[PDB]
From a paper:
Ruminococcus gnavus is a human gut symbiont wherein the ability to degrade mucins is mediated by an intramolecular trans-sialidase (RgNanH). RgNanH comprises a GH33 catalytic domain and a sialic acid-binding carbohydrate-binding module (CBM40). RgCBM40 binds to mucus produced by goblet cells and to purified mucins, providing direct evidence for a CBM40 as a novel bacterial mucus adhesin.
Protein ligand complexes were achieved for both 3′SL and 6′SL. Definitive electron density for the Neu5Ac and galactose residues was observed in the 3′SL and 6′SL complexes. Contrastingly, for the 3′SL complex, only partial electron density was observed for the glucose residue in a single monomer, and the glucose positioning indicates that the lactose points up and away from the binding site, without further interactions with the protein. In the 3′SL complex, the lactose positioning would permit further extensions to the carbohydrate chain as would be present in more complex or anchored glycans, whereas these may be blocked in the 6′SL complex. Notably, the carboxylic acid group of Neu5Ac forms electrostatic interactions with an arginine dyad, Arg204 and Arg128, mimicking the coordination observed in sialidase active sites. The C4 hydroxyl group hydrogen bonds to Lys135 and Glu126, the N-acetyl group sits in a hydrophobic pocket formed by Tyr116 and Ile95. The N-acetyl group nitrogen interacts with both Glu126 and Tyr210. Both 3′SL and 6′SL bound with similar low affinities, with dissociation constants of 0.57 mM and 1.70 mM, respectively.
Author numbering:
A (entry chain B): 7 to 105, 111 to 196
B (entry chain A): 7 to 106, 112 to 195
């Protein structure tokens, strides 16, 4: 099963929606691998909108976070960061989703294969293999989980507006076939 | 054989070294796929140092370029950009090289397989697959090739300092085994 799930969460641009106190959030804050699946509708023209983030929101730690994000040009991406000297692993895919319309995206991080895969609307859109595999448990001082933005020194960065229709986070690594199916209509 | 090669080029921080007029530069400016192999020594503490770039250096086109870069913290990466709405395909690998010392890195971009692979000092360090494969020929208005920085609105960005010991650009997609051997 999922370790954290939410449904029907509408977010006013800029505000975010804090998940840090939810049952399961502690698990999400320590993930060594796993899968994130999100259905959403954006109503914002912000250039970078985090759907889900997990990171360190404290002063001086603004480059220590993970987020799965969309853009105002129909892009989908993620960033996994613990300051640039430690790691900055990113995917950014163009023309993968559309903006008002429901989309479903997913990211998996697979420790055994050292691989990250991004899916949108029933398609695998990118794969990253890194010799030095990292995930959330490698970020230093993770203290929050949020929908619709990323906490950076107490400010909601990369603000989303619209609806998080469904969000599920898994410790399990779903198969590509599963993610093609679950991100479809 | 390479389509563009240079050896023994010193570059001070900020200066760059223009290759735009060299025979073969036109080919580099239009690559649909290929391989870049560079041996270098950095003397600079700049956080992002382009070893080789190919892009559009004109005003308002600062997000239209390709570069293969190293960092002050022993990292290696690349960015391939034509404005973020079009594409922004990147790799960034930590603790892959050392400043201390000569290092050799390589990037291949394989159109058939829609794949980019980065190598450093005899190891494959990252692989990127993109559904929408892009390379230099997809960048709009490419007008320069340089060593040791990236031209952005007439300024040398991401400035390298040190020596480009050997730089080769190929239209061919070299094998992983070839790259493991040449970089190690
Ligand atoms: C998702 C993404 O591309 N994020 C970038 C981020 C954004 O480009 C920016 O916040 C708004 O578009 O920029 C990051 O880098 C910044 C640097 O480019 C800038 O020189 O200095 C900034 C600090 O004032 C900041 O470090 C960022 O916000 O961390 C890098 C990130 O990948
Ligand atoms: C290799 C890399 O991370 N390149 C980044 C670049 C560098 O982080 C930065 O130039 C070094 O200081 O930052 C880029 O994004 C910038 C935005 O973060 C910033 O909000 O606005 C800047 C323009 O005034 C700039 O766009 C960049 O320089 O393009 C993104 C790039 O991937």
């Amino acid at each position: 099963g999922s370790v954290l799930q939410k449904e029907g969460i509408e977010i006013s641009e800029g505000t975010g929606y804090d998940l840090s106190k939810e049952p399961g959030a502690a698990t999400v804050k320590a993930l060594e691998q796993g899968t994130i699946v999100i259905s959403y509708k954006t109503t914002s023209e912000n250039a970078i909108q985090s759907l889900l983030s997990v990171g360190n929101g404290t002063k001086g730690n603004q480059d220590r976070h993970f987020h799965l994000y969309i853009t105002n040009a129909g892009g989908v991406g993620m960033e996994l960061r613990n300051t640039d000297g430690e790691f900055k692993y990113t995917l950014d895919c163009p023309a993968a989703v559309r903006g008002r319309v429901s989309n479903t995206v997913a990211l998996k991080a697979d420790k055994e294969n050292k691989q990250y895969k991004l899916f949108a609307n029933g398609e695998l859109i990118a794969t990253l293999d890194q010799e030095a595999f990292k995930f959330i448990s490698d970020i230093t001082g993770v203290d929050n989980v949020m929908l619709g933005g990323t906490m950076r020194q107490g400010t909601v960065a990369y603000p989303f507006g619209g609806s998080i229709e469904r969000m599920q986070v898994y410790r399990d690594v779903l198969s590509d076939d599963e993610l093609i199916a679950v991100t479809g209509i």
